[PDB]
PDB file of C-alpha atoms in Angstrom:
ATOM      1  CA  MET A   1     -20.895  -5.325 -37.272  1.00  0.00           C
ATOM      2  CA  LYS A   2     -20.406  -4.390 -33.804  1.00  0.00           C
ATOM      3  CA  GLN A   3     -16.741  -5.255 -34.384  1.00  0.00           C
ATOM      4  CA  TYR A   4     -16.044  -3.170 -37.312  1.00  0.00           C
ATOM      5  CA  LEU A   5     -17.943  -0.147 -36.255  1.00  0.00           C
ATOM      6  CA  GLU A   6     -16.723  -0.253 -32.720  1.00  0.00           C
ATOM      7  CA  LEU A   7     -13.737   0.061 -34.772  1.00  0.00           C
ATOM      8  CA  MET A   8     -14.221   3.347 -37.072  1.00  0.00           C
ATOM      9  CA  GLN A   9     -15.430   5.064 -33.708  1.00  0.00           C
ATOM     10  CA  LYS A  10     -11.531   4.007 -32.666  1.00  0.00           C
ATOM     11  CA  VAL A  11     -10.335   5.405 -35.069  1.00  0.00           C
ATOM     12  CA  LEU A  12     -12.286   8.740 -35.058  1.00  0.00           C
ATOM     13  CA  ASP A  13     -11.493   9.315 -31.280  1.00  0.00           C
ATOM     14  CA  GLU A  14      -8.046   7.911 -30.996  1.00  0.00           C
ATOM     15  CA  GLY A  15      -6.302   8.195 -34.544  1.00  0.00           C
ATOM     16  CA  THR A  16      -3.833  10.746 -35.360  1.00  0.00           C
ATOM     17  CA  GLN A  17      -3.556  12.614 -38.523  1.00  0.00           C
ATOM     18  CA  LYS A  18      -1.207  12.027 -41.323  1.00  0.00           C
ATOM     19  CA  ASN A  19      -1.038  10.420 -45.132  1.00  0.00           C
ATOM     20  CA  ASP A  20      -0.716   7.611 -47.239  1.00  0.00           C
ATOM     21  CA  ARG A  21       1.900   6.910 -49.702  1.00  0.00           C
ATOM     22  CA  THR A  22       2.160  11.067 -50.512  1.00  0.00           C
ATOM     23  CA  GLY A  23      -1.304  12.157 -50.678  1.00  0.00           C
ATOM     24  CA  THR A  24      -4.532  11.172 -49.281  1.00  0.00           C
ATOM     25  CA  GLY A  25      -4.032  12.089 -45.363  1.00  0.00           C
ATOM     26  CA  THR A  26      -5.404   9.187 -43.384  1.00  0.00           C
ATOM     27  CA  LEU A  27      -6.523   9.197 -39.560  1.00  0.00           C
ATOM     28  CA  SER A  28      -3.961   5.644 -38.017  1.00  0.00           C
ATOM     29  CA  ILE A  29      -3.999   3.848 -35.178  1.00  0.00           C
ATOM     30  CA  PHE A  30      -1.168   1.660 -34.476  1.00  0.00           C
ATOM     31  CA  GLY A  31      -2.728  -2.311 -33.240  1.00  0.00           C
ATOM     32  CA  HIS A  32      -5.932  -3.194 -33.152  1.00  0.00           C
ATOM     33  CA  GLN A  33      -7.218  -6.817 -32.523  1.00  0.00           C
ATOM     34  CA  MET A  34     -11.431  -7.756 -33.028  1.00  0.00           C
ATOM     35  CA  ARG A  35     -12.983 -11.645 -32.628  1.00  0.00           C
ATOM     36  CA  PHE A  36     -15.515 -12.728 -34.925  1.00  0.00           C
ATOM     37  CA  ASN A  37     -17.206 -16.307 -33.510  1.00  0.00           C
ATOM     38  CA  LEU A  38     -17.869 -17.380 -36.743  1.00  0.00           C
ATOM     39  CA  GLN A  39     -21.114 -19.733 -35.267  1.00  0.00           C
ATOM     40  CA  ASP A  40     -22.931 -16.682 -34.526  1.00  0.00           C
ATOM     41  CA  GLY A  41     -23.008 -16.051 -38.236  1.00  0.00           C
ATOM     42  CA  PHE A  42     -20.952 -15.052 -41.649  1.00  0.00           C
ATOM     43  CA  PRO A  43     -19.141 -11.744 -41.165  1.00  0.00           C
ATOM     44  CA  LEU A  44     -20.472 -10.154 -44.020  1.00  0.00           C
ATOM     45  CA  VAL A  45     -20.944  -6.185 -43.182  1.00  0.00           C
ATOM     46  CA  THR A  46     -23.968  -5.663 -43.252  1.00  0.00           C
ATOM     47  CA  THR A  47     -24.278  -0.986 -42.687  1.00  0.00           C
ATOM     48  CA  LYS A  48     -23.820  -0.847 -46.374  1.00  0.00           C
ATOM     49  CA  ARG A  49     -24.776  -3.369 -48.964  1.00  0.00           C
ATOM     50  CA  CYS A  50     -21.271  -5.708 -49.133  1.00  0.00           C
ATOM     51  CA  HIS A  51     -21.074  -8.745 -52.142  1.00  0.00           C
ATOM     52  CA  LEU A  52     -19.587 -11.879 -52.577  1.00  0.00           C
ATOM     53  CA  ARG A  53     -18.507 -12.865 -56.083  1.00  0.00           C
ATOM     54  CA  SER A  54     -15.571 -10.496 -55.884  1.00  0.00           C
ATOM     55  CA  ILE A  55     -14.366 -11.191 -52.669  1.00  0.00           C
ATOM     56  CA  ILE A  56     -15.088 -15.038 -53.873  1.00  0.00           C
ATOM     57  CA  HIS A  57     -13.060 -15.519 -57.046  1.00  0.00           C
ATOM     58  CA  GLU A  58     -10.299 -13.635 -55.421  1.00  0.00           C
ATOM     59  CA  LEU A  59     -10.084 -16.706 -52.916  1.00  0.00           C
ATOM     60  CA  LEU A  60     -10.262 -19.650 -56.028  1.00  0.00           C
ATOM     61  CA  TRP A  61      -7.814 -17.778 -57.663  1.00  0.00           C
ATOM     62  CA  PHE A  62      -5.338 -16.614 -54.343  1.00  0.00           C
ATOM     63  CA  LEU A  63      -6.292 -21.571 -54.571  1.00  0.00           C
ATOM     64  CA  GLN A  64      -4.882 -21.502 -57.278  1.00  0.00           C
ATOM     65  CA  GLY A  65      -1.739 -20.796 -56.879  1.00  0.00           C
ATOM     66  CA  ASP A  66      -1.476 -18.482 -60.592  1.00  0.00           C
ATOM     67  CA  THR A  67      -1.094 -14.800 -59.955  1.00  0.00           C
ATOM     68  CA  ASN A  68      -2.349 -13.534 -63.577  1.00  0.00           C
ATOM     69  CA  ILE A  69      -5.667 -12.041 -64.070  1.00  0.00           C
ATOM     70  CA  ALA A  70      -6.767 -13.667 -66.451  1.00  0.00           C
ATOM     71  CA  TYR A  71      -9.605 -15.970 -64.663  1.00  0.00           C
ATOM     72  CA  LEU A  72     -10.490 -12.899 -62.496  1.00  0.00           C
ATOM     73  CA  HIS A  73     -10.606 -11.139 -66.510  1.00  0.00           C
ATOM     74  CA  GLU A  74     -13.201 -14.029 -67.336  1.00  0.00           C
ATOM     75  CA  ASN A  75     -14.890 -13.311 -64.269  1.00  0.00           C
ATOM     76  CA  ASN A  76     -15.567  -9.932 -64.710  1.00  0.00           C
ATOM     77  CA  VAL A  77     -13.336  -9.598 -61.404  1.00  0.00           C
ATOM     78  CA  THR A  78     -11.984  -5.552 -61.386  1.00  0.00           C
ATOM     79  CA  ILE A  79      -9.977  -5.652 -58.804  1.00  0.00           C
ATOM     80  CA  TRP A  80      -6.289  -6.307 -59.269  1.00  0.00           C
ATOM     81  CA  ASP A  81      -6.657  -4.143 -62.945  1.00  0.00           C
ATOM     82  CA  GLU A  82      -5.423  -1.844 -61.180  1.00  0.00           C
ATOM     83  CA  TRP A  83      -1.967  -3.582 -60.811  1.00  0.00           C
ATOM     84  CA  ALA A  84      -1.674  -6.351 -62.985  1.00  0.00           C
ATOM     85  CA  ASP A  85       0.903  -5.110 -66.427  1.00  0.00           C
ATOM     86  CA  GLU A  86       0.056  -5.734 -70.453  1.00  0.00           C
ATOM     87  CA  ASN A  87       0.247  -9.442 -69.847  1.00  0.00           C
ATOM     88  CA  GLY A  88      -1.822  -9.425 -66.737  1.00  0.00           C
ATOM     89  CA  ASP A  89       0.846 -10.521 -64.668  1.00  0.00           C
ATOM     90  CA  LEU A  90       1.510  -8.802 -60.941  1.00  0.00           C
ATOM     91  CA  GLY A  91       4.401 -11.041 -59.741  1.00  0.00           C
ATOM     92  CA  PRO A  92       4.723 -13.267 -56.770  1.00  0.00           C
ATOM     93  CA  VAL A  93       1.473 -11.745 -54.480  1.00  0.00           C
ATOM     94  CA  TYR A  94       0.037 -14.014 -52.533  1.00  0.00           C
ATOM     95  CA  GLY A  95      -1.439 -17.139 -54.884  1.00  0.00           C
ATOM     96  CA  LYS A  96       2.651 -17.061 -55.607  1.00  0.00           C
ATOM     97  CA  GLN A  97       3.850 -17.301 -51.867  1.00  0.00           C
ATOM     98  CA  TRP A  98       1.130 -19.688 -50.521  1.00  0.00           C
ATOM     99  CA  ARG A  99       1.595 -22.757 -52.907  1.00  0.00           C
ATOM    100  CA  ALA A 100       4.980 -22.292 -54.157  1.00  0.00           C
ATOM    101  CA  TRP A 101       6.525 -19.951 -52.286  1.00  0.00           C
ATOM    102  CA  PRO A 102      10.606 -20.676 -53.685  1.00  0.00           C
ATOM    103  CA  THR A 103      13.318 -21.025 -51.177  1.00  0.00           C
ATOM    104  CA  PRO A 104      16.979 -20.603 -52.203  1.00  0.00           C
ATOM    105  CA  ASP A 105      17.197 -24.807 -53.075  1.00  0.00           C
ATOM    106  CA  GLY A 106      14.659 -24.677 -55.404  1.00  0.00           C
ATOM    107  CA  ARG A 107      12.175 -26.001 -54.506  1.00  0.00           C
ATOM    108  CA  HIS A 108       8.409 -24.526 -53.876  1.00  0.00           C
ATOM    109  CA  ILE A 109       6.415 -24.498 -51.367  1.00  0.00           C
ATOM    110  CA  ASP A 110       2.910 -25.601 -50.725  1.00  0.00           C
ATOM    111  CA  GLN A 111       1.796 -23.824 -47.821  1.00  0.00           C
ATOM    112  CA  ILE A 112      -1.510 -24.715 -48.396  1.00  0.00           C
ATOM    113  CA  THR A 113      -0.613 -28.265 -48.303  1.00  0.00           C
ATOM    114  CA  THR A 114       1.239 -28.122 -45.378  1.00  0.00           C
ATOM    115  CA  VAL A 115      -1.609 -26.783 -43.657  1.00  0.00           C
ATOM    116  CA  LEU A 116      -4.299 -28.772 -44.510  1.00  0.00           C
ATOM    117  CA  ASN A 117      -0.826 -31.524 -43.464  1.00  0.00           C
ATOM    118  CA  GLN A 118      -1.089 -30.430 -39.663  1.00  0.00           C
ATOM    119  CA  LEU A 119      -4.284 -29.789 -39.986  1.00  0.00           C
ATOM    120  CA  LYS A 120      -5.510 -33.499 -40.016  1.00  0.00           C
ATOM    121  CA  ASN A 121      -2.054 -35.042 -38.263  1.00  0.00           C
ATOM    122  CA  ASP A 122      -0.650 -32.525 -35.870  1.00  0.00           C
ATOM    123  CA  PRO A 123      -3.926 -30.323 -34.953  1.00  0.00           C
ATOM    124  CA  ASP A 124      -2.222 -29.234 -31.891  1.00  0.00           C
ATOM    125  CA  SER A 125       0.581 -27.723 -33.505  1.00  0.00           C
ATOM    126  CA  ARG A 126       1.444 -24.176 -32.379  1.00  0.00           C
ATOM    127  CA  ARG A 127       3.104 -23.595 -36.150  1.00  0.00           C
ATOM    128  CA  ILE A 128      -0.571 -24.073 -38.564  1.00  0.00           C
ATOM    129  CA  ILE A 129       0.919 -20.270 -39.971  1.00  0.00           C
ATOM    130  CA  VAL A 130       0.677 -19.211 -44.032  1.00  0.00           C
ATOM    131  CA  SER A 131       3.246 -16.877 -45.630  1.00  0.00           C
ATOM    132  CA  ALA A 132       2.897 -14.375 -47.743  1.00  0.00           C
ATOM    133  CA  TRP A 133       5.784 -12.296 -46.316  1.00  0.00           C
ATOM    134  CA  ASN A 134       8.138 -12.885 -48.813  1.00  0.00           C
ATOM    135  CA  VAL A 135      10.662 -10.706 -48.472  1.00  0.00           C
ATOM    136  CA  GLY A 136      13.323 -11.543 -50.986  1.00  0.00           C
ATOM    137  CA  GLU A 137      10.971 -11.132 -53.736  1.00  0.00           C
ATOM    138  CA  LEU A 138       8.585  -8.302 -52.719  1.00  0.00           C
ATOM    139  CA  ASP A 139      10.684  -6.119 -55.042  1.00  0.00           C
ATOM    140  CA  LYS A 140       9.017  -8.509 -57.994  1.00  0.00           C
ATOM    141  CA  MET A 141       5.367  -8.178 -56.186  1.00  0.00           C
ATOM    142  CA  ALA A 142       3.656  -5.652 -58.042  1.00  0.00           C
ATOM    143  CA  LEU A 143       1.731  -4.879 -54.333  1.00  0.00           C
ATOM    144  CA  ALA A 144       3.949  -5.525 -51.067  1.00  0.00           C
ATOM    145  CA  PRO A 145       1.283  -8.661 -49.694  1.00  0.00           C
ATOM    146  CA  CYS A 146      -1.716  -6.487 -47.090  1.00  0.00           C
ATOM    147  CA  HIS A 147      -3.441  -9.389 -45.457  1.00  0.00           C
ATOM    148  CA  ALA A 148       0.754 -10.764 -44.172  1.00  0.00           C
ATOM    149  CA  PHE A 149       0.899 -14.419 -42.369  1.00  0.00           C
ATOM    150  CA  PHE A 150      -1.956 -15.890 -40.761  1.00  0.00           C
ATOM    151  CA  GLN A 151      -1.898 -18.917 -38.125  1.00  0.00           C
ATOM    152  CA  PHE A 152      -4.863 -21.116 -37.090  1.00  0.00           C
ATOM    153  CA  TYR A 153      -5.380 -23.643 -33.878  1.00  0.00           C
ATOM    154  CA  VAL A 154      -7.454 -25.836 -33.396  1.00  0.00           C
ATOM    155  CA  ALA A 155      -9.767 -26.464 -29.443  1.00  0.00           C
ATOM    156  CA  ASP A 156     -12.858 -28.383 -28.894  1.00  0.00           C
ATOM    157  CA  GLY A 157     -13.324 -29.634 -31.850  1.00  0.00           C
ATOM    158  CA  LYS A 158     -13.794 -26.134 -33.868  1.00  0.00           C
ATOM    159  CA  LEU A 159     -11.059 -24.480 -36.410  1.00  0.00           C
ATOM    160  CA  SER A 160     -10.002 -20.488 -35.261  1.00  0.00           C
ATOM    161  CA  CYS A 161      -7.676 -18.338 -37.491  1.00  0.00           C
ATOM    162  CA  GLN A 162      -5.743 -14.874 -37.104  1.00  0.00           C
ATOM    163  CA  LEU A 163      -4.421 -12.565 -39.549  1.00  0.00           C
ATOM    164  CA  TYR A 164      -1.274 -10.217 -39.288  1.00  0.00           C
ATOM    165  CA  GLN A 165      -2.878  -7.461 -41.696  1.00  0.00           C
ATOM    166  CA  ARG A 166      -0.172  -5.239 -41.666  1.00  0.00           C
ATOM    167  CA  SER A 167      -2.354  -2.055 -43.108  1.00  0.00           C
ATOM    168  CA  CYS A 168      -6.132  -1.151 -44.446  1.00  0.00           C
ATOM    169  CA  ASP A 169      -7.443   1.157 -45.332  1.00  0.00           C
ATOM    170  CA  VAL A 170     -10.362  -0.030 -42.335  1.00  0.00           C
ATOM    171  CA  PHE A 171     -14.012   1.441 -45.174  1.00  0.00           C
ATOM    172  CA  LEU A 172     -12.419   0.760 -48.181  1.00  0.00           C
ATOM    173  CA  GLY A 173     -10.506  -1.993 -47.836  1.00  0.00           C
ATOM    174  CA  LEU A 174     -12.035  -4.252 -44.871  1.00  0.00           C
ATOM    175  CA  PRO A 175     -15.389  -5.046 -45.376  1.00  0.00           C
ATOM    176  CA  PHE A 176     -14.324  -7.364 -48.094  1.00  0.00           C
ATOM    177  CA  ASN A 177     -10.938  -8.672 -46.163  1.00  0.00           C
ATOM    178  CA  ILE A 178     -12.919  -9.844 -42.956  1.00  0.00           C
ATOM    179  CA  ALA A 179     -15.853 -12.077 -45.475  1.00  0.00           C
ATOM    180  CA  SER A 180     -12.269 -13.040 -47.372  1.00  0.00           C
ATOM    181  CA  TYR A 181     -10.296 -14.670 -44.223  1.00  0.00           C
ATOM    182  CA  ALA A 182     -13.922 -16.515 -42.663  1.00  0.00           C
ATOM    183  CA  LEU A 183     -15.169 -18.135 -45.901  1.00  0.00           C
ATOM    184  CA  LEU A 184     -11.116 -19.568 -45.983  1.00  0.00           C
ATOM    185  CA  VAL A 185     -11.838 -20.899 -42.772  1.00  0.00           C
ATOM    186  CA  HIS A 186     -15.295 -22.049 -43.102  1.00  0.00           C
ATOM    187  CA  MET A 187     -14.237 -23.767 -46.421  1.00  0.00           C
ATOM    188  CA  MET A 188     -10.813 -25.626 -44.635  1.00  0.00           C
ATOM    189  CA  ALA A 189     -13.040 -26.597 -41.331  1.00  0.00           C
ATOM    190  CA  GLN A 190     -15.636 -27.926 -44.063  1.00  0.00           C
ATOM    191  CA  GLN A 191     -12.198 -30.337 -45.406  1.00  0.00           C
ATOM    192  CA  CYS A 192     -11.277 -31.093 -42.212  1.00  0.00           C
ATOM    193  CA  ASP A 193     -15.031 -32.111 -40.473  1.00  0.00           C
ATOM    194  CA  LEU A 194     -13.973 -29.097 -38.271  1.00  0.00           C
ATOM    195  CA  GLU A 195     -16.686 -26.633 -36.729  1.00  0.00           C
ATOM    196  CA  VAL A 196     -15.768 -22.995 -36.994  1.00  0.00           C
ATOM    197  CA  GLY A 197     -14.028 -20.655 -34.584  1.00  0.00           C
ATOM    198  CA  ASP A 198     -13.488 -17.246 -34.105  1.00  0.00           C
ATOM    199  CA  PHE A 199     -11.593 -15.256 -37.140  1.00  0.00           C
ATOM    200  CA  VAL A 200      -9.228 -13.355 -35.411  1.00  0.00           C
ATOM    201  CA  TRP A 201      -8.011  -9.804 -37.209  1.00  0.00           C
ATOM    202  CA  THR A 202      -4.993  -7.817 -36.417  1.00  0.00           C
ATOM    203  CA  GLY A 203      -4.472  -4.592 -37.444  1.00  0.00           C
ATOM    204  CA  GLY A 204      -0.699  -3.066 -38.009  1.00  0.00           C
ATOM    205  CA  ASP A 205      -1.578   0.498 -39.196  1.00  0.00           C
ATOM    206  CA  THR A 206      -4.898   0.543 -39.220  1.00  0.00           C
ATOM    207  CA  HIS A 207      -6.539   4.155 -41.405  1.00  0.00           C
ATOM    208  CA  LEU A 208      -9.452   6.069 -41.902  1.00  0.00           C
ATOM    209  CA  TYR A 209      -8.615   8.316 -45.746  1.00  0.00           C
ATOM    210  CA  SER A 210     -10.144  11.961 -45.313  1.00  0.00           C
ATOM    211  CA  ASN A 211     -12.310  11.674 -47.710  1.00  0.00           C
ATOM    212  CA  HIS A 212     -13.803   9.085 -46.717  1.00  0.00           C
ATOM    213  CA  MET A 213     -14.734  10.784 -43.035  1.00  0.00           C
ATOM    214  CA  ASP A 214     -18.376  11.498 -44.109  1.00  0.00           C
ATOM    215  CA  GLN A 215     -19.257   7.909 -45.477  1.00  0.00           C
ATOM    216  CA  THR A 216     -18.471   6.659 -41.804  1.00  0.00           C
ATOM    217  CA  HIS A 217     -20.556   9.771 -39.857  1.00  0.00           C
ATOM    218  CA  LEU A 218     -22.783   8.101 -41.934  1.00  0.00           C
ATOM    219  CA  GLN A 219     -22.380   3.772 -41.530  1.00  0.00           C
ATOM    220  CA  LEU A 220     -21.422   4.868 -37.848  1.00  0.00           C
ATOM    221  CA  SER A 221     -25.267   6.211 -37.692  1.00  0.00           C
ATOM    222  CA  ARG A 222     -26.626   2.783 -38.643  1.00  0.00           C
ATOM    223  CA  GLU A 223     -27.848  -0.199 -36.952  1.00  0.00           C
ATOM    224  CA  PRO A 224     -25.713  -3.497 -37.944  1.00  0.00           C
ATOM    225  CA  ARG A 225     -28.058  -6.342 -39.011  1.00  0.00           C
ATOM    226  CA  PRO A 226     -28.443  -9.267 -38.265  1.00  0.00           C
ATOM    227  CA  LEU A 227     -25.833 -11.544 -39.297  1.00  0.00           C
ATOM    228  CA  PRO A 228     -26.188 -14.293 -42.173  1.00  0.00           C
ATOM    229  CA  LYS A 229     -25.964 -17.559 -42.319  1.00  0.00           C
ATOM    230  CA  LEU A 230     -22.449 -19.075 -45.195  1.00  0.00           C
ATOM    231  CA  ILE A 231     -23.630 -22.151 -46.827  1.00  0.00           C
ATOM    232  CA  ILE A 232     -22.125 -24.657 -48.901  1.00  0.00           C
ATOM    233  CA  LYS A 233     -23.692 -26.582 -50.932  1.00  0.00           C
ATOM    234  CA  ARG A 234     -20.841 -29.191 -51.886  1.00  0.00           C
ATOM    235  CA  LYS A 235     -17.914 -31.053 -49.925  1.00  0.00           C
ATOM    236  CA  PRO A 236     -15.330 -31.246 -52.141  1.00  0.00           C
ATOM    237  CA  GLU A 237     -12.339 -34.112 -52.512  1.00  0.00           C
ATOM    238  CA  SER A 238     -10.129 -30.890 -51.753  1.00  0.00           C
ATOM    239  CA  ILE A 239      -9.155 -27.462 -50.613  1.00  0.00           C
ATOM    240  CA  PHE A 240      -8.389 -26.197 -54.485  1.00  0.00           C
ATOM    241  CA  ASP A 241     -11.647 -28.110 -55.782  1.00  0.00           C
ATOM    242  CA  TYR A 242     -14.244 -25.280 -55.235  1.00  0.00           C
ATOM    243  CA  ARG A 243     -16.690 -23.658 -57.358  1.00  0.00           C
ATOM    244  CA  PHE A 244     -17.459 -20.380 -57.737  1.00  0.00           C
ATOM    245  CA  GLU A 245     -21.356 -21.317 -57.543  1.00  0.00           C
ATOM    246  CA  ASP A 246     -20.269 -24.319 -54.439  1.00  0.00           C
ATOM    247  CA  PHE A 247     -21.342 -20.485 -52.304  1.00  0.00           C
ATOM    248  CA  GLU A 248     -24.588 -18.409 -50.837  1.00  0.00           C
ATOM    249  CA  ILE A 249     -25.203 -16.640 -47.975  1.00  0.00           C
ATOM    250  CA  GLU A 250     -29.140 -16.690 -46.458  1.00  0.00           C
ATOM    251  CA  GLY A 251     -30.459 -13.653 -44.236  1.00  0.00           C
ATOM    252  CA  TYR A 252     -28.239 -11.279 -45.478  1.00  0.00           C
ATOM    253  CA  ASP A 253     -30.172  -7.362 -45.137  1.00  0.00           C
ATOM    254  CA  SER A 254     -28.697  -5.043 -45.867  1.00  0.00           C
ATOM    255  CA  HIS A 255     -28.801  -1.266 -46.229  1.00  0.00           C
ATOM    256  CA  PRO A 256     -27.500   1.041 -48.648  1.00  0.00           C
ATOM    257  CA  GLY A 257     -24.316   0.908 -50.308  1.00  0.00           C
ATOM    258  CA  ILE A 258     -21.734   3.794 -50.053  1.00  0.00           C
ATOM    259  CA  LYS A 259     -19.590   4.565 -52.543  1.00  0.00           C
ATOM    260  CA  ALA A 260     -15.445   4.697 -51.962  1.00  0.00           C
ATOM    261  CA  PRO A 261     -13.680   7.575 -53.777  1.00  0.00           C
ATOM    262  CA  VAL A 262     -10.313   7.726 -54.256  1.00  0.00           C
ATOM    263  CA  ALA A 263      -7.881   9.887 -55.118  1.00  0.00           C
ATOM    264  CA  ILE A 264      -4.641   9.101 -57.781  1.00  0.00           C
TER     265      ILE A 264
END
């Protein structure tokens, strides 16, 4: 997409050379923001072939709050295998914080329900927020949250959302990340009888790995194509009742896929 390709080019032109947690070096910039008007189409990268299968399953999994990869496993979703232990546990990552943030007085806070409560009764609130950055549980997580915090906003009958991504692998992770949150906005908007607004992506340490340079140049040589249209075949009773089959993508015309090799 135009915004995505412009970001790739920016990292190439302005990024500084350094390293990741000891391993492959990177070109990185700090602080970036881009906006996707969801009314112009579902933001699924077209300059390389992308799939929504893993994205959908992972989001439904987040919304359920269970941080065991069992569900992902039964559906052949392997993106979290790398971090799961023998029992398939990941610790209190995303889902746990979204649905049951532990408080020091013994309670578990359901931030998703809290947000839906706010959108319904106080849509002009300036604190419709969900945070996965639970400082007190970071050490127990298999992975410190990458998409750390997001906020919703309502205006002119449209629902918008801004995500703060503390660290981002522009080539491998970003396409997945953008589509995941765009999907969530569509679901939230459907439950609140609102139209979709903008998805605002804000990043911290935004980088390109040195071994992805040829892949990036190849993708930058491709012209982006008409964004597809997200179709939600059903209208569930709540945000927790969506099913994989409820989502469909129409008019998705993409360029060939590009593999993303990683060092170990």
